[PDB]
């Protein structure tokens, strides 16, 4: 699949960057390819839990 790290996260939206260079943004419920749809966004920790169990987390080389 395409693995996505986040570039910005605030209460509500979160701006995500994938490995293809594509930039997107998500909310409490939004369809994300492969990862399902977002279950919740935690801006304080910088996590997003999705339906597929996949956790979206600030890129290892930028967090």
């Amino acid at each position: 699949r395409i693995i996505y790290y986040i570039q910005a996260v605030i209460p509500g939206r979160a701006w995500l960057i994938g490995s293809n260079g594509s930039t997107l943004t998500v909310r409490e419920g939004s369809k994300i390819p492969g990862y399902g749809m977002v279950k919740l966004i935690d801006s304080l920790q910088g996590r997003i839990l999705t339906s597929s169990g996949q956790v979206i987390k600030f890129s290892q080389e930028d967090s």
Binding site: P11, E28, Q45
Partner: peptide, 9 residues
């Protein structure tokens, strides 16, 4: 809808 900073364990 949920503001996590208003969070409590």
């Amino acid at each position: 809808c949920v503001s996590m900073i208003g969070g409590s364990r």
